[PDB]
Amino acid sequence: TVSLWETVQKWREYRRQCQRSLTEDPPPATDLFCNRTFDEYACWPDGEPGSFVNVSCPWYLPWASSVPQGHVYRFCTAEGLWLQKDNSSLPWRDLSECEESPEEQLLFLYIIYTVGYALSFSALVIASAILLGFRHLHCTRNYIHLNLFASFILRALSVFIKDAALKWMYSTAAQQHQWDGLLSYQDSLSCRLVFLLMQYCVAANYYWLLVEGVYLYTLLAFSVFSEQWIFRLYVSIGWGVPLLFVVPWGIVKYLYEDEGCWTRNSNMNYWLIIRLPILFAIGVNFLIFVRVICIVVSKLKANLTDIKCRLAKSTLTLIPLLGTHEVIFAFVMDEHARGTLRFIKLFTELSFTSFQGLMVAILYCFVNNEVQLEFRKSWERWRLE
């Protein structure tokens, strides 16, 4: 990995190393010696007339390991100056040699996970109004849904802010030749905090899918706990617990791996501080998924193709609520996944996670019969007017 930060530094050392070198080199003193210089790619010495003035391929290059032995040529004319390409003052130079010998598969992903996050963000502000609006729908089950709806909104919101930073850092500035502002933004804590709010908002969305599973689990475990006490516990688990490993992750990457604005997981044993606790929430919510479905099959055999159809509608409706679609490809670690399996993994985890917020709003606010009854009852009353 080459950071634009590091390519610049090595170049600057290449300036200093040659800026002093340029002044030191004693002249050949000979008649008509063409003058040494540094013209912002590689620095030549004085080269005697009728000769190729040959310089090693500069070491600051990112592809410097690729071509350890290479040459840019400049020619010194017999009159004793640099040879000239026609149509300008720029001395004849040869960049045939130092020249170096993906994206598209990485943009269809950006296309299809922005739209999913946008039709989820839209459907979840609408579904939060409906739940918060009607007073008859105010219950602890809908208070868990509202907090879960606010996790998908924050997660979809923070991915828009992050994708309007990454795009500003490289696509905007670096394609506009801003090596001054781009590098400076990376140093600003503001760049770090947006990719620190992204880690918290993703983590708080997994831990609110966990609160949904845990709450539904206590309901089915015939466990009538104190309603008051557990709700403050559920708010402190969905929103509070994510701080117990995101903040310890932020300070570790502040002291030890504070580079490239925390965007790159350069060391993968610190990525564990975020990944592993999330795999615990994904792991636990899959054991609730199997126990809940095992409960549903017991209920369906008592009131006995029809059971197979009702089971399929039950399993498919439960999947968005618990986010168990990613148990398929979340125990393939980032470290150990490479090649097509790093697309399909990234495909089924970005194309589904983006649309998962939308599927929750449709299944638990728009097709829910307690809402469709409260909509009609708020229209049948409005037929009086």
Binding site: S3, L166, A174, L346
Partner: peptide, 30 residues
């Protein structure tokens, strides 16, 4: 999670395609 993986994918890839831009600007600089 998928987000950090994809973000580290593009940031690594863009960062690089921008170190290619720095070398190009140097070559064109003069």
């Amino acid at each position: 999670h998928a987000e950090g993986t994809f973000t580290s994918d593009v940031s690594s890839y863009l960062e690089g395609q921008a170190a290619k831009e720095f070398i190009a600007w140097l070559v064109k600089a003069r």
